Structure formats: structure tokens, C-alpha cells
Write a protein that binds this DNA or RNA. Structure first.
Ligand SMILES: [Mg+2]
Ligand SMILES: [Mg+2]
Ligand SMILES: [Mg+2]
Ligand SMILES: [Mg+2]
Ligand SMILES: [Mg+2]
Ligand SMILES: [Mg+2]
Ligand SMILES: [Mg+2]
Ligand SMILES: [Mg+2]
Ligand SMILES: [Mg+2]
Ligand SMILES: [Mg+2]
Ligand SMILES: [Mg+2]
Ligand SMILES: [Mg+2]
Ligand SMILES: [Mg+2]
Ligand SMILES: [Mg+2]
Ligand SMILES: [Mg+2]
Ligand SMILES: [Mg+2]
Ligand SMILES: [Mg+2]
Ligand SMILES: [Mg+2]
Ligand SMILES: [Mg+2]
Ligand SMILES: [Mg+2]
Ligand SMILES: [Mg+2]
Ligand SMILES: [Mg+2]
Ligand SMILES: [Mg+2]
Ligand SMILES: [Mg+2]
Ligand SMILES: [Mg+2]
Ligand SMILES: [Mg+2]
Ligand SMILES: [Zn+2]
Lengths: 71, 64
RNA sequence: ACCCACUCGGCACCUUACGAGAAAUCAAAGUCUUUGGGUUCUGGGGGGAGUAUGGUCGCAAGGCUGAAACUUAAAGGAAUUGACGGAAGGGCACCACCAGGAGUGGAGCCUGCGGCUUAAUUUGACUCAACACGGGGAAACUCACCAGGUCCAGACACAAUAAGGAUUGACAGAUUGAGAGCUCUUUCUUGAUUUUGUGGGUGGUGGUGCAUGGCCGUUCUUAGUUGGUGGAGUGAUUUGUCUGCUUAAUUGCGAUAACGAACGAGACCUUAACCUACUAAAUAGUGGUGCUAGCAUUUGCUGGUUAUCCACUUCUUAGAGGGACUAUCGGUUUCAAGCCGAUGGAAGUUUGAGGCAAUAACAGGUCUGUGAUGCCCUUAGACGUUCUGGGCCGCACGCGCGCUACACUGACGGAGCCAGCGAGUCUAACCUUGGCCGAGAGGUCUUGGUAAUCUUGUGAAACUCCGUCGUGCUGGGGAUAGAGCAUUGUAAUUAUUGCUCUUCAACGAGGAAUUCCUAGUAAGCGCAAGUCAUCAGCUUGCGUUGAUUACGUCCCUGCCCUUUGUACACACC
């Protein structure tokens, strides 16, 4: 047939990053705990899930995408 | 037509290592046994066999 | 000189074979393993080679005599069956000609093939047996090609990573053709389903049809193939299966060391033809009668009414039977099979047309129909797949199939007005009557039909009739092109198709060549079906109108058969 072409530059993939994440609570002087990052008021996301802070933007990743609560 | 009547065919593909071969089987059933159709080939012509007679004998007649 | 008989010795031929031979053959090539009449000469697998060398003869050319080393499994003879021939003799056929028809080849366009062009213009096939073929009428899809964008649908096994998270997804922005989280920013989400690697798989319209199956085409519009018992031969084989005749036919008759048979042909099957005989029918139809319209009236004529009743089965339908067997008679012939004519008959060309179809051959075509398939290739920056867009249509040109034409046996306009084979909608939008609207194409409201019930009597077209035109590229012809309207579809630009106005080309019967065809056939003419969302100038079938000319032959071409040659048998590639 032919075999190969290309003007260079191959597309990569994704990472899903690292992060030893969930440090985003705050436990006080033995031993009260106050959750940072506000949680999501959907019937499908039982408060365990949280909102990511961007700009304007607060976002439920649990809703695989859905819903855009903003304060 | 007797084909439709009396022969049964079947091909089968047997799949071996070097390639495949085809089996082709033919069977011709005895038409005399046919049970539910022509009991013979359209060919068949049977002549019934006469009986050796002892004729002659001048008239005569029976009564009842 | 001639005729007859005989006899020595000649040149030969004929017929047999006791006998001989590996056979072909042979009155010797016989009288040979039952091996001896006398004598001469030569050969001992094939090449090397009649070569080297020595001797001898010769003017020469060369004659006679005449090795080895080495190489090699065969070379050779006769006969048999095939295969083949640019040998001979017969045949057969409208894919041959004769007698003719209608044409193609010339034109415009349609359509395939080449060629060129191209990002790509995907590809198979090239005499009959490639080129309107791949059911191949491609706008997406199809799709194989080109410009580019995702996804894994990477089974399984081992290992690695790793719950302090293997991996998953994403809103907005950026980006992108794109409201693809493709990638990137950002920071949630997911919880052992993945991700990495190795191994192993997997898909593929990737290659190989010169690895295969299966199917198909071709030889073949052909008539060939085989076994029993006997005859011939050491044998492979042959005869049977053949000079002639006859048939569409190895179909038969007849001749006959053959007799009597089996495959294929025939028979058979399907369809078209004939049934006032049989069984029937509100899904077919007839006569009568009720109800009823029109005209005439003297009873009459022509209609209406899926049931107002009665009877029938001619027409229609499809079950069962019947019918034809070239019958009767005649002419011809080996008075054989048969052929020919007249009568009758629905039918007498295998009744017409098909289906089926032995053995064998081909490197025929098909891996691009198949989740048929071996092997090779490729497998995540994919030759997997899908999404967007282009392309298969691209145009100096060569070749094929076609369509429409050059008019007056016609075009146009009114009017007459007649088929046959089909097909149609369920978890759906198929076939469409009727009513309106619209110049048309179409639109809209309803409706019947899963159908002998409705579309549909498919009122099809050629055709027939009365008119206009009047031989003028004319009103024959309708290419090309403009401008508008609609239909299919997500989508119509490179115009899907349909309609309207306008534009009005070549073509004035076609050189060399070439195709098909013998009766409801050729030709003319439409229609249904396949394809199909939309698109037939294609095909498969169908009926409508309906001829001229053979009813022969071997000139051409093609093939088959015998005879014959062969050093071929992987068979003249
Ligand atoms: Mg020979
Ligand atoms: Mg002629
Ligand atoms: Mg001519
Ligand atoms: Mg090839
Ligand atoms: Mg595409
Ligand atoms: Mg792997
Ligand atoms: Mg590998
Ligand atoms: Mg495949
Ligand atoms: Mg082949
Ligand atoms: Mg094959
Ligand atoms: Mg013929
Ligand atoms: Mg013998
Ligand atoms: Mg013979
Ligand atoms: Mg009847
Ligand atoms: Mg007559
Ligand atoms: Mg080949
Ligand atoms: Mg195949
Ligand atoms: Mg094409
Ligand atoms: Mg053709
Ligand atoms: Mg007219
Ligand atoms: Mg209008
Ligand atoms: Mg209905
Ligand atoms: Mg004109
Ligand atoms: Mg015209
Ligand atoms: Mg159609
Ligand atoms: Mg076609
Ligand atoms: Zn949520």
C-alpha cells in the first residue's frame, strides 16, 4: 500500500493526576470536624459528594457532569 | 422429478488444519418401499405373466 | 501365336497356422528348457565415442584397425489408451450461411470499459466465455478511496501498579467542523469493573480465486459413460459402443462375435392449449324475479340497486379425471426404423415454452455474499470501528450496451377506447378510490384493502376516428441553456426526481464492418416486478398489434466424429 505519513505531533492521553486528596476536612481541638468545600443538594448525591471551587463556579463532579450551583 | 423423489443430498464443510474440504453425500432410496409416493421409477414397465392354458374341449355347459 | 494338364528352376502375391515371437509380424523369423545338421561373422546398459593413441592405406578428403579416465538409472523396442496437429474423410447449427426481416456501426444524449486528470477519482473482470456484468440505478449510509476527528467493542493467563486510591467521568473556558472533557486550564467525581507490560487472542470490503470449500460460467443449441455373460489378446486393452440408414438425441432400424442391460438422452416435472362430462362458489359470474331510471310505447331497448328472493355453473376459479398415441388413409424408403402429403382433431415442428440433467475438463470467475476457510499481512499515531466533509459523476480523447430520431404508413389537437404477469400497512405509515383546492407538478379532507373482497375493468401504449399542418432542418428532431414552482430526504451546490415558460443543436437513412431472429415468432408498443426515502434511458417477466422470407445446404465461421502421425502423458501454455 503505502505505510506512514505524519507532519509530527502525536496526541497523548489523560493522567487523572495524583493527590493524596481528602485532607479537606478540618478537625479541631479534639475532636470536632468541619467540612471544607460545600456539598451537593441533589437527590442523587447524598451530601457525601462535594463542590469544586473554580471561578464563580461551584461544581458537582458526582453528577458525572450535571448541575452548577454557584455562590 | 424422480430426483426430487428418490435421492437425498447433503454437503458439509469439514475444516482441517491445511484448509477445508467439502463432503458431498448422495443416497438413493429403494423406490419399491417408497410408502407415500411413486412405488417405482417412471421407467418401470411390468408385464403381467399369462398362464399356460389347457383349451380344446368341444362345448358342454354346466347347470345350477 | 494361343488353350488345358503336368514338371523342374525363377521374381513375387494370396489364405491360413500346426508352429515362432515382447509384440508388429513371420513358409521362415518354423521344426528350441522335449534346448546339438555343417560353417563364417558381429553384440553384451546408456553416454564418454567411432573420440584419444599407435599402426597402416591415401595426393587430399579421408578408409581400416581402435581404447581408457570420467559420468550416468536409465537409455531403448513393440503394442495400448489418451492428448494434440499449420494431414484425409464425414457431419451438425440463424451464438453458421442461404432466402429475407429488424437493425447496430454515422448523430444527440444515457450508460459501462479504457485512457487522462485527480487529495482521492476505491475495486473485480478483457475473444466467444470482460465492458446496462459484480443484481454495481453510490447525494449521507452503502464504501472498499481521499482530507481529518473519536472510541476499544485489546477474551483470557501471569506479572506490575494500587485502597494512603488501580481506574472512571465531567460543567465552563480554551480548543474543534462540531453542544467530542480529543487535548489543555481548574478540581470534583468514580472504587478495583480498569491502567502498564509480557504472552495469547481479536477484528479486517487487507493479500493470495496460483493454497481451499461452496457456488457459478465455459466445453455443451453437446451425446456421451459403464458393467454382466460370450468372442479376440501374454498384457495394457479390444469387441459389445459398427460401413449404411435414420433421429433433436449411442434416437432407432439394419449389418453383425456378439447377446442382453444400467447411467446420460427419453421417460419424468412445470407452465400454455381442449372439456355445455364430474365436485362447487355473496371473495367469480350468468338467467329469472322483486325495487327502480330513461327512451319508446304494442309486448320492446338500455341502465341502477355486496343480499329483496329463486335457479343454474356456459363464461371465471382449481380439485379429480378424461385427451394424442405423429391417429385414419395415402406416397416414399432396403416398403426396416422413419420422412412426406391429405382428412379429422383443442392440439400432430420433442404439441409450444421451460425445469431437471451423467462422466470429464479449466490453474475460467468468486477470499468484495457468508460468523465458509489455510497461510501471509495488520492490530491503538489501526488496514478495527465510528463521526464530519469530499470522491466513485471528475474530461483533448479510443471502445462496447442502449435510448430518442431524421417525419406525411407522420407530428400535433380533440374524440374512440382495449390487456396480461404483479405488489401492497403491526406493533405501522405500504397499495390508494372518492371530495375539494391548484395551469401543472402537487396539496388537503376523508376512505377501502393483511386482499379473487379494496387500489384495479390497473379505461396501459402502440392503435382506431374527425380535424390542423403540407414538405420547408417544417409544427420532423429535442440536445444544450436561462428563469420560476413543487416532491423525497437530516441533507439536493457538482443542477435526485416532477412541472411551467423560454432557448431549438446534431441528425436529411448512415464507410469498412457487425448483431439477433422461422409463428402469435421478428419487429413495433406499453405495463408490473426487482432495485427503491427519492432516482430506469437497466433487467426479469407480461400481455397488446402483428409481418416479409427459409423449411435448404456446407460457401464462410464454430464445433463434434472417424481415419492417420507423434519422440507429447505436467499431454502443443
Ligand atoms: Mg497411437
Ligand atoms: Mg443473409
Ligand atoms: Mg444492413
Ligand atoms: Mg487478482
Ligand atoms: Mg463517510
Ligand atoms: Mg496485550
Ligand atoms: Mg503481540
Ligand atoms: Mg472478512
Ligand atoms: Mg479457479
Ligand atoms: Mg473454485
Ligand atoms: Mg436453433
Ligand atoms: Mg482371455
Ligand atoms: Mg467407439
Ligand atoms: Mg365450467
Ligand atoms: Mg386441418
Ligand atoms: Mg487464474
Ligand atoms: Mg466466496
Ligand atoms: Mg462506477
Ligand atoms: Mg451484455
Ligand atoms: Mg394522436
Ligand atoms: Mg396557482
Ligand atoms: Mg381500515
Ligand atoms: Mg424547426
Ligand atoms: Mg417535437
Ligand atoms: Mg420501479
Ligand atoms: Mg443494473
Ligand atoms: Zn450533584
Amino acid at each position: 500500500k503505502k505505510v506512514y505519513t505524519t507532519p509530527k505531533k502525536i496526541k497523548h492521553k489523560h493522567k487523572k493526576v495524583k493527590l493524596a486528596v481528602l485532607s479537606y476536612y478540618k478537625v479541631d481541638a479534639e475532636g470536632k470536624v468541619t467540612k471544607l468545600r460545600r456539598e451537593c443538594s441533589n437527590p442523587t448525591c447524598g451530601a457525601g459528594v462535594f463542590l469544586a471551587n473554580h471561578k464563580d463556579r461551584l461544581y458537582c463532579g458526582k453528577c458525572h457532569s450535571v448541575y452548577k450551583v454557584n455562590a | 422429478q424422480p430426483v426430487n423423489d428418490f435421492i437425498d443430498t447433503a454437503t458439509r464443510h469439514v475444516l482441517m488444519r491445511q484448509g477445508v474440504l467439502g463432503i458431498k453425500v448422495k443416497i438413493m432410496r429403494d423406490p419399491a418401499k417408497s410408502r407415500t409416493g411413486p412405488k417405482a421409477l417412471p421407467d418401470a414397465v411390468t408385464i403381467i405373466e399369462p398362464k399356460e392354458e389347457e383349451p380344446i374341449l368341444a362345448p358342454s355347459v354346466k347347470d345350477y
